[PDB]
């Protein structure tokens, strides 16, 4: 089956969408149209966030679909069939969830790593770049996979720094060293 297996629950829709549009080789188109409908979701916040709530009928749900495709005709065509599916399956809470899942799955198919460098402080751009350079230099990036790297500030990380990407982390923390100290100086 098409690259990158996602075991998403209601993400099975995204997986399906991916393989279906991969086999029709209209995945870039899909991604772009998905961005556009996702944008029109964000740009429809009243009753497009506040009526993603399940209270819609079949008939009323269908008419929400019809209003959305009146707003734009930039649709994959397979995602118009997917829109039909989501209306019929009354999948609406995991609607942006499916969008996110297809986006991740798609841009994984395209290749693009994600990453974050959670820290106790917002690091320099020089730091971002130096670390990004370092990460690309390290055999972790083997090419065919790009990178996103967001340093985030989290008070929770006490001590060190933590680099995260590719399910590979280096987690420097004070806490572990404190732990060893505490245990042995109480025993």
């Amino acid at each position: 089956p098409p690259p990158v297996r996602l075991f998403g629950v209601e993400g099975t829709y995204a997986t399906a969408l991916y393989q279906a549009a991969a086999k029709n080789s209209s995945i870039d188109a899909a991604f772009q149209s998905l961005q556009k409908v996702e944008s029109t979701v964000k740009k429809n916040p009243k009753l497009g966030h506040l009526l993603l709530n399940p209270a819609l009928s079949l008939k009323d749900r269908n008419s929400v679909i019809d209003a959305i495709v009146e707003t734009h005709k930039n649709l994959d065509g397979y995602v118009v069939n997917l829109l039909k599916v989501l209306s019929e399956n009354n999948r609406l809470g995991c609607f942006e969830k499916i969008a996110s899942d297809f986006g991740v799955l798609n841009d994984a198919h395209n290749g693009l790593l994600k990453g974050t460098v959670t820290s106790a402080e917002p690091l320099d751009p020089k730091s971002f770049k130096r670390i990004e350079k370092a990460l690309s230099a390290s055999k972790l990036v083997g090419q065919g996979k790009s990178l996103k790297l967001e340093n985030v500030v989290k008070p929770e990380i006490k001590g060190g720094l933590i680099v995260e990407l590719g399910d590979k982390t280096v987690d420097l923390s004070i806490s572990t060293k404190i732990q060893k100290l505490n245990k042995v100086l109480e025993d």
Partner: protein, 498 residues
């Protein structure tokens, strides 16, 4: 834009705060989507006409248990919140009234004069607002008074095999509470509140007829939730009886509440819980049935004198199915209650009617609400009976008996005959103390087993004729003086076999 307008057109257009629209409904347990504002346990008016309390709140669908038939409910209906947790009219007007669970007179004496309303849920008085129990309640059943004396406040559990006239045991208490009712005892009188759950209208009606025959219903309140009546209303029925009682208790008036059958309350809560999809506790009674029962039972109390000194007394009535007490609901209740009053069916057939299984009959905290005279006389009644139990085992081996054992055996048989009573006959303590004196002082040992019943009646007649002064004194002073004891001993001797 135009899209948004068309979306707005098909939208709910209600914020669903303080209201919400039904979305499915089957099995009488509705679930509504909305109700963003909603207090728990609140009463919500379905547009069908039904009112329903709310027992399940879920972020999706708030589960409002209907109090009526769902035959007029349909999906997509609106329910508009009453905005009030359930409430009952409480007051003095309830005396001599049958009222249903929702607190509507079903006696057909029309609107109650029950001044005030209260809420079903009321939190029980703490340790601090209470005084120790010390106030007799006499049920006119010799065994009950002597062996398991009931105090005002206390919870004494009536337990035993179903439909052995379990209700009739309780009715006897009501009948002896006729003596206080006639009396000027008011702050010393129990207003008796009989709660009937799961029972047919005709049975209850027969009971009220019996009560009306016995001219007692000038202090009786009958709270009813018949078998026909809804399971939510049935679940709510003990707690709303409790609130009605607490108004009496609050006034400083003493009262007594019979919760018959509490076992049927458990079945009702079982139905609710499993259709609120709550996890089933053992025996399919949810694992918090205990919480419901415990809170209910602890709302009968003997208040402190700063809190008046009012006292609601409770008698829960639990059916034992096959006499099974290891069953979850009986086990739970036994722990909760401050007495157990096991009845025995075999002994019912043996002719103790009421038949109290006196070995398993306990008053957990015991005696402190027992007549002083009656404390003296029934002192060794227990010892004799205990010896009798051992002796009886030997006696049923049916061999030649130790002479000592035959003293026990002969006395023991008479004791059993003293225990035997006849349903719907209450008895005055002033004349029950003599009978126990006679028995314990072995004057009954002489007279043959058959004619003990004759002796009791005749002896009482003799005392009524001659030592009627003695009876008056026993009534007045409630403890036996040396002079009274001597008079009584002499009297028994005088009428020993006539």
């Amino acid at each position: 834009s135009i899209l948004e307008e068309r979306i707005k057109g098909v939208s709910d257009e209600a914020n669903l705060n303080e209201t919400g629209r039904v979305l499915a409904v089957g099995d009488g347990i509705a679930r509504v989507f909305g109700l963003n504002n909603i207090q728990a346990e609140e009463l919500v008016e379905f547009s069908s006409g039904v009112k329903g309390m709310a027992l399940n709140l879920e972020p999706g669908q708030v589960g409002i248990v209907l109090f009526g038939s769902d035959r007029l409910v349909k999906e997509g209906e609106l329910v508009k919140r009453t905005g009030n947790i359930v409430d009952v009219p409480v007051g003095p007007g309830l005396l001599g009234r049958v009222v249903d669970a929702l607190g509507n007179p079903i006696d057909g004496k029309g609107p109650i004069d029950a001044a005030g309303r209260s809420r079903a849920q009321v939190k029980a008085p703490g340790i601090l607002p209470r005084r120790s129990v010390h106030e007799p309640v006499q049920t006119g059943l010799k065994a009950v008074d002597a062996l398991v004396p009931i105090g005002r406040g206390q919870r004494e559990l009536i337990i035993g095999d179903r439909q052995t006239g379990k209700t009739a045991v309780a009715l006897d208490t009501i009948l002896n509470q006729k003596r206080w009712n006639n009396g000027s005892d008011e702050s010393k009188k129990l207003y008796c509140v009989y709660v009937a759950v799961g029972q047919k209208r005709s049975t209850v009606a027969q009971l009220v007829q019996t009560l009306e025959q016995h001219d007692a219903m000038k202090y009786s309140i009958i709270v009813a939730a018949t078998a026909s009546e809804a399971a939510p209303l049935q679940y709510l029925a003990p707690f709303t009886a409790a609130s009605i009682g607490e108004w009496f208790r609050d006034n400083g008036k003493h009262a007594l509440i019979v919760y018959d059958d509490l076992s049927k309350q458990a079945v009702a809560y079982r139905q609710l819980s499993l259709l609120l999809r709550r996890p089933p506790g053992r025996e399919a009674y949810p694992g918090d049935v205990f919480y419901l029962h415990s809170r209910l039972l602890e709302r009968a109390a003997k208040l402190s004198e700063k809190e008046g000194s009012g006292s609601l007394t409770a008698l829960p009535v639990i059916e034992t199915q096959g006499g099974d007490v290891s069953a979850y609901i009986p086990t739970n209740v036994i722990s909760i209650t401050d007495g157990q009053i096991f009845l025995e069916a075999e002994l019912f057939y043996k002719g103790i009617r009421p038949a109290i299984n006196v070995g398993l009959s306990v008053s957990r905290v015991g005696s402190a609400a027992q007549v002083k005279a009656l404390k003296q006389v029934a002192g060794s009644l227990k010892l004799f009976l205990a010896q009798y139990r051992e002796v009886a085992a030997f006696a049923q081996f049916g061999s030649d008996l130790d002479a000592s054992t035959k003293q026990t055996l002969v006395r023991g048989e008479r004791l059993t005959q003293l225990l035997k009573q006849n349903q719907y006959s209450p008895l005055a303590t002033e004349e029950q103390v003599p009978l126990i004196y006679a028995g314990v002082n072995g004057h009954l040992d002489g007279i043959e087993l058959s004619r003990i019943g004759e002796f009791e009646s005749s002896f009482l007649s003799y005392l009524k004729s001659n030592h009627n002064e003695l009876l008056t004194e026993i009534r007045e002073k409630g403890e036996l003086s040396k002079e009274l004891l001597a008079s009584l001993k002499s009297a028994t001797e005088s009428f020993v076999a006539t």
